Amino acid sequence: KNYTFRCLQMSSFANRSWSRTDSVVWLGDLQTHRWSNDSATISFTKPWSQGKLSNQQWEKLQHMFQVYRVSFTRDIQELVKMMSPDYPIEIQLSAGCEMYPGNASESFLHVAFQGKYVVRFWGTSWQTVPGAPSWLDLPIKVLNADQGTSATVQMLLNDTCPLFVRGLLEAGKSDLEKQEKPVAWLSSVPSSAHGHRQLVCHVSGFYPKPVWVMWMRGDQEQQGTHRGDFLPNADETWYLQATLDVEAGEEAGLACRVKHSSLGGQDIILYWGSLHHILDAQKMVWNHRHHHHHH
Amino acid sequence: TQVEQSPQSLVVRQGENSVLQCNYSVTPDNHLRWFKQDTGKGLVSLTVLVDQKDKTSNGRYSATLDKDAKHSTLHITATLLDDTATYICVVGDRGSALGRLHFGAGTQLIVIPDIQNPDPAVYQLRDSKSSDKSVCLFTDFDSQTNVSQSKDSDVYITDKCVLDMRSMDFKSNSAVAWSNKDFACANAFNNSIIPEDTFFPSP
Amino acid sequence: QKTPQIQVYSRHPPENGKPNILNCYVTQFHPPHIEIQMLKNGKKIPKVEMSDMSFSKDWSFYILAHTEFTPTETDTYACRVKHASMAEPKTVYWDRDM
Amino acid sequence: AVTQSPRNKVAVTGGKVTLSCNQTNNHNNMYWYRQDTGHGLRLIHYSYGAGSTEKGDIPDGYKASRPSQENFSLILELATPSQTSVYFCASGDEQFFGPGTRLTVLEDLKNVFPPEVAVFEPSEAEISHTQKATLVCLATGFYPDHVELSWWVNGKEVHSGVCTDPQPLKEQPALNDSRYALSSRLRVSATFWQNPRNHFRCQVQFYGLSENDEWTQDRAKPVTQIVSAEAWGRAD
Ligand SMILES: CCCCCCCCCCCCCCCCCCCCCCCC(=O)N[C@@H](CO[C@H]1O[C@H](CO)[C@H](O)[C@H](O)[C@H]1O)[C@H](O)[C@H](O)CCCCC
Ligand SMILES: *[C@@H]1O[C@H](CO)[C@@H](O)[C@H](O)[C@H]1NC(C)=O
Ligand SMILES: CCCCCCCCCCCC
Numbered sequence: 107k108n109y110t111f112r113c114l115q116m117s118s119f120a121n122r123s124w125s126r127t128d129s130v131v132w133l134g135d136l137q138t139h140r141w142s143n144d145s146a147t148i149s150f151t152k153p154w155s156q157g158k159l160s161n162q163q164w165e166k167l168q169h170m171f172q173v174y175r176v177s178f179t180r181d182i183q184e185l186v187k188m189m190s191p192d193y194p195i196e197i198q199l200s201a202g203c204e205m206y207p208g209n210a211s212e213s214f215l216h217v218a219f220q221g222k223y224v225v226r227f228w229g230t231s232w233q234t235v236p237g238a239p240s241w242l243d244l245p246i247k248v249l250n251a252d253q254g255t256s257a258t259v260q261m262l263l264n265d266t267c268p269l270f271v272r273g274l275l276e277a278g279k280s281d282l283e284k285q286e287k288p289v290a291w292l293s294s295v296p297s298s299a300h301g302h303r304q305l306v307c308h309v310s311g312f313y314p315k316p317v318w319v320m321w322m323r324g325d326q327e328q329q330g331t332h333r334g335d336f337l338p339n340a341d342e343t344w345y346l347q348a349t350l351d352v353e354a355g356e357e358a359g360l361a362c363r364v365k366h367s368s369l370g371g372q373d374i375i376l377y378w379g380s381l382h383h384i385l386d387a388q389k390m391v392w393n394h395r396h397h398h399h400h401h
Numbered sequence: 402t403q404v405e406q407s408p409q410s411l412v413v414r415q416g417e418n419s420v421l422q423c424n425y426s427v428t429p430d431n432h433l434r435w436f437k438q439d440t441g442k443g444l445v446s447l448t449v450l451v452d453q454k455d456k457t458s459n460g461r462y463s464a465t466l467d468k469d470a471k472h473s474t475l476h477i478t479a480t481l482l483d484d485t486a487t488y489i490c491v492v493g494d495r496g497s498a499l500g501r502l503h504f505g506a507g508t509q510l511i512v513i514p515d516i517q518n519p520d521p522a523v524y525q526l527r528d529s530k531s532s533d534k535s536v537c538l539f540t541d542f543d544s545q546t547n548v549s550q551s552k553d554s555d556v557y558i559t560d561k562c563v564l565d566m567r568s569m570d571f572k573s574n575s576a577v578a579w580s581n582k583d584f585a586c587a588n589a590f591n592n593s594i595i596p597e598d599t600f601f602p603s604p
Numbered sequence: 605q606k607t608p609q610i611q612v613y614s615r616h617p618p619e620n621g622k623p624n625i626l627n628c629y630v631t632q633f634h635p636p637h638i639e640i641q642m643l644k645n646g647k648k649i650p651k652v653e654m655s656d657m658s659f660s661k662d663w664s665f666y667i668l669a670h671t672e673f674t675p676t677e678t679d680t681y682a683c684r685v686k687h688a689s690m691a692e693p694k695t696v697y698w699d700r701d702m
Numbered sequence: 703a704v705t706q707s708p709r710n711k712v713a714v715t716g717g718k719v720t721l722s723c724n725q726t727n728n729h730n731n732m733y734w735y736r737q738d739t740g741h742g743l744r745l746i747h748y749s750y751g752a753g754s755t756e757k758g759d760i761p762d763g764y765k766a767s768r769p770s771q772e773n774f775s776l777i778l779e780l781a782t783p784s785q786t787s788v789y790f791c792a793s794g795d796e797q798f799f800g801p802g803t804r805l806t807v808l809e810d811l812k813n814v815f816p817p818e819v820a821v822f823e824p825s826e827a828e829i830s831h832t833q834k835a836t837l838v839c840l841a842t843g844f845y846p847d848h849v850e851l852s853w854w855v856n857g858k859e860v861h862s863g864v865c866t867d868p869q870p871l872k873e874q875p876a877l878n879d880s881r882y883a884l885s886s887r888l889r890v891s892a893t894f895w896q897n898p899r900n901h902f903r904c905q906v907q908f909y910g911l912s913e914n915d916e917w918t919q920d921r922a923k924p925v926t927q928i929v930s931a932e933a934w935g936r937a938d
Contacts, residue, residue: 114658116636116665130656140656173429177495184499188750196635198663221606221634221663252497254431291617293701306701310615337629339615340655340670345627390618392677396697404742434796440868443704443790444743444799489742498731498750502797504742522831526822526838529933536822536838538887557873559885562865566834566889575865577838577885602827 108206109134109282111271115199117182122193125179133274135315136281136342146172152281158273167266170258185245196220203267205275213263227259285368286343288312292362292376292383293390296400303352305378307362310345318365319348322375328360403427404505406490412511414544419480419510423473423490427503431496433466435475438487438507447475477510482565482572485512513544514563514572521546522600525586537586540575542596548576549593556580558590606664607689608633610696612682618675618700626698628669628683636665639686639693645679675700703727704800706791710848710909712814713807719778721803723791732774733792734758734766737802743790749774781807804909806846811915813879814924816908817844819931824895835895839904839931841884843873848909853888856901863889900935 110132117127131139138155141148148168150156156164182197200216215227224238231250234242250256275282290309297304309319315336321328330350337345348362357378364374377383404425413419423433432451436444448457450466450473457464461484463476477484490505521542528534539548548561558578565572578589587601609632615625628642636657642649655668673681681698705724713719723732730751735743745758747766755766763785765777774793778785786807791800808814820842824835841849847870853860866886874880886904894900910924917923 116657116659118636128657130658132658137656177429181495181499187754187756191750191754191756194635198659218663223663248498252495254496289617295699295701308617310617337611337613337627338655338668339627340625340653340668341615345613345615386617389620390675390700391620392675392700395680398697398699398702402742441802443801446796449796498795501745502743504744506740506742520832522828524825524828524836526825526836529821529823529931534820534822536840536885538825538828538836538838540828540836541832554874554876557871557883559867559871560869562867562887564863564865564887564889567862569891573889575836575887577840577887579840600827600831602825 108204109271109275110202110204111267111274112200112202113139115201117178117197117199119182119186119195119197120193122183122186125183127175127179133271133278134282136278138274138278141171152278154274154277154281157270157277159270181249185248188245188248189241201263203263203271205268205271209272211268211271213267215259215263227263230256230260282314284313286311286313287368288317288364288366288374290362290364290374290376291386292378293387294357295398297351298401299351301354303354303357305350305352305357305360307348307350307364307376308345309347309364311339311343312346312366312368313343314367315344316367317344317346319346320363321348321350322361322363323359402506404490404492404503406488406505406508408508409506410509410511412513413480415482415512415515416479419477419484421475421477421488421508421510423475423505425471425473425490425492425503425505427471427492427494429494430468430471430492431500432493433473434491434493435462435464435473436489436491438489440486444489480510480512482512482514482563484510486510514574516541516543516572516574519543519596520600521596521598522602523586523590524602525604535579537578537589538575539578539590539593541573542599544574546574546596547593548590551578552592553580555582556584556589558592605689606632606634608638608685608687608694610683610685610694612696612698614675614698614700615670620676621674623672623674625670626673626681629666630669630683630685631660631666632664633666633687633689634664635688637688638665638667640667640669641684641686642669642671643680643682643684643695644673646682649673704791704793704798706789706800706803708803709801710804711806712811712846712848712910713778713781713805714811714915715781715783715807715809717781717807719781719785719805719807721776721778721789721791721805723774723776723800724772725793725798726772727793727795727798728771729793729795729798730771731794731797732768733794733797734764734774734776735790735792736760736787737790738787747776783807783809804848806848808846811911811917811924812919813845814910815843815845815881816910816924816927817841817849817884817906817929819904819906819929821902821904821931821933823933823936829892829895833892835890835892837888837890837902837904837933839886839888839906841886841906841929843881843883844908845879845881847882847884849882849884850907851884851886852905852907853886854903854905855888855890860888863887895935896937897935898937901932902934903930903932905930 112132115129119125126143129141137151198218203211203213217225232246288309289311293306295304321331332349334347360378362376407422434449435447438444448464453468455466461478466473487507487509489507492503493500524538526536551558561574561576608630611629613627642652649671652671657667659665682695684693684695686693707722732749734746746764749768752771767775789803820840822838851866870882870884872880906929909926
């Protein structure tokens with residue numbers, strides 16, 4: 107029942123006179139905001155992305171980030187000049203808060219350098235993590251001398267994050283509780299092992315994320331079933347495949363069973379070798395170029 | 402320029418209050434600092450203003466800051482002679498070592514002495530080494546008098562100067578004129594306007 | 605410096621002659637700078653929409669590219685990715701059976 | 703405290719100039735500014751510590767060097783007339799500014815003259831009328847305007863009763879390289895002047911050519927020197 111809100115910033119510094127900063131904001135697995143380097147304005151990716159905040163409340167918050175983006179860029183490159191008078195440099199920020207029932211939350215601000223987590227804002231200051239390069243000590247000391255920033259970050263983590271997200275959760279309640287029915291189909295590919303076959307159960311178009319997919323022989327769940335990774339669709343729905351390795355001839359009798367919250371107890375059951383399966387397969391026949399390698 | 406000061410220069414009577422302005426467009430504006438620069442010297446800090454709405458005080462000096470207006474004001478209460486200096490407004494864009502200071506051109510403050518008893522006169526002074534060379538000294542006039550420059554290229558006239566005789570608590574103005582030439586002290590300052598009761602001793 | 609992973613898959617069940625959407629999901633790469641092309645018969649598809657780049661819990665970057673397409677028996681579809689961790693660009697063809 | 707050397711320098715176009723800056727404050731950051739009328743200090747070069755040197759807003763024509771924490775130097779390889787300014791150095795952990803360096807870069811040194819100094823004794827008319835006595839010192843025919851004037855009574859420098867012109871005047875205002883004139887005043891009580899044991903001296907420090915500067919002209923070499931005029935008290 108918990109929802110994680112995250113602002114993700116990626117900054118690139120190729121040399122002394124080149125930089126770009128791009129950001130995305132996610133509430134759970136729904137994108138709420140976008141902030142391209144090209145744009146002077148933070149953009150909404152939802153009609154409810156403002157939350158419960160007023161226009162004047164939003165402008166003051168955006169202005170703060172606008173001052174931040176310019177300042178961050180200049181601060182990094184001035185710190186580069188301190189340490190290596192190396193390049194290129196990649197910096198990532200993960201800022202936000204996780205929500206818990208009821209009215210309680212924990213905030214975070216993580217910073218990575220070259221793809222390794224090195225610094226976090228903790229309490230009232232910046233802190234290096236355990237196992238971090240010792241050259242960071244000086245930049246940290248330099249940055250911790252800024253009381254104005256410390257206060258502003260504290261306000262954003264302790265107060266502003268939870269206040270905004272609660273507003274987002276009420277504003278976007280309808281989209282978060284939205285139900286989308288999955289569709290499934292069957293295919294098969296050669297296994298890497300000689301004489302074997304890999305049956306694929308494609309499950310696509312479902313929302314929300316949680317799903318159950320298993321290959322069955324009647325009442326028996328096949329313990330060889332392998333869930334793949336969740337893969338996104340462009341319309342914010344999800345794709346997943348469940349594979350099963352079988353010896354040639356043991357395909358018959360098998361079924362792919364899918365359980366989802368949008369189905370309401372009425373599971374999708376696709377049987378291998380059924381009339382339905384034969385019809386779908388002949389609608390997707392092709393020349394098999396340039397199929398994925400098999401060895 | 403991102404830091405503008407007004408007026409360009411300010412003339413005030415000794416003992417009165419003087420007001421100096423600052424307007425900036427620096428973003429972000431962490432702090433604002435006022436400096437005093439004596440002629441032929443360095444910048445010496447007077448006060449720091451940090452908060453969104455800030456007020457500061459240090460003896461005769463008192464300043465205010467409004468960040469929403471991006472405006473500052475420096476007050477000098479009961480101005481002294483030694484307060485004659487350039488006052489410079491400085492805005493810093495970070496609260497850290499990675500900051501850049503932004504400077505205004507400065508206001509020149511000129512404090513003119515209150516001469517209680519004007520005794521204006523033009524005297525002729527002779528060279529210590531030679532008898533022939535001489536200068537003219539216009540002295541002891543009130544700060545009402547402005548000393549005009551020379552219309553003749555052969556005549557040299559200096560701008561007015563304030564001297565404090567400390568143990569006597571006596572202040573006086575003076576301007577010096579000389580010519581390489583028909584030149585005479587009684588008509589040396591003919592380009593300026595003289596008081597009616599100016600003493601012109603006969604040479 | 606990590607290598608991109610390319611996964612190509614259709615939005616709906618592949619049906620010959622029926623309009624669909626093809627997805628190229630590129631993951632596990634770093635640095636973020638990347639060039640992504642979707643190809644029909646080796647030629648660049650002009651109408652390709654790209655999602656905003658993001659990153660995951662291991663700080664590796666990911667991005668989704670998608671285009672409107674029609675699967676057939678003979679038309680080939682591929683996703684080509686240019687990245688600094690590779691000398692030559694990587695091409696992964698759409699296999700509907702995978 | 704922040705120290706700069708030199709305090710005054712006269713240079714030629716195409717010559718080398720090195721301005722020094724020393725601080726014992728133990729600050730990491732060091733700065734080099736210049737001050738020109740109608741501007742406000744502008745950053746030439748700055749440093750983040752020993753080994754570091756970075757371009758400011760106006761670095762063109764200037765180099766910088768930070769050999770140690772204490773020293774930061776501004777180097778002018780080929781000096782130009784536009785680099786005539788007052789230079790300020792600063793250090794910070796708030797910045798602390800040095801006393802400044804006056805630099806004049808000229809096209810030719812053949813126009814450089816030391817000042818002639820003359821002291822003018824008080825009039826009897828002033829003495830009778832005011833019971834005070836004003837001495838006037840005149841420093842004339844110098845180029846460039848690099849003079850520091852001071853009054854010395856009986857061997858000790860005085861400040862009380864002194865006014866020196868803040869600005870010099872051009873002896874020929876229509877000329878680009880006119881020689882300058884500066885005047886100053888020392889006012890004492892009549893009785894002080896009327897004492898023959900009292901000695902008055904006007905001291906003018908001039909800044910011009912240095913030991914390594916080449917000079918060929920028939921007249922005396924216009925080096926950095928002190929020129930003085932003096933007067934004794936008079937009973938009469
Ligand atoms: C977080 C949840 C918020 C919920 C709202 C959701 C809306 C989503 C909007 C999408 C934006 C996503 C971007 C994610 C990044 C989050 C980090 C925010 C940190 C904000 C820091 C504010 C302070 C600041 O901008 N300070 C820089 C100027 O500081 C100067 O100016 C200030 C006045 O503006 C002060 O006077 C300060 O003393 C001065 O140094 C200063 O260079 C500083 O080193 C910058 C570097 C610090 C960072 C490493
Ligand atoms: C949540 O906490 C805030 C202050 O931390 C409080 O003002 C508010 O009343 C709380 N929310 C609810 C729904 O009670
Ligand atoms: C020796 C490597 C020097 C690189 C300097 C980059 C400093 C960026 C600091 C990031 C932490 C916020």
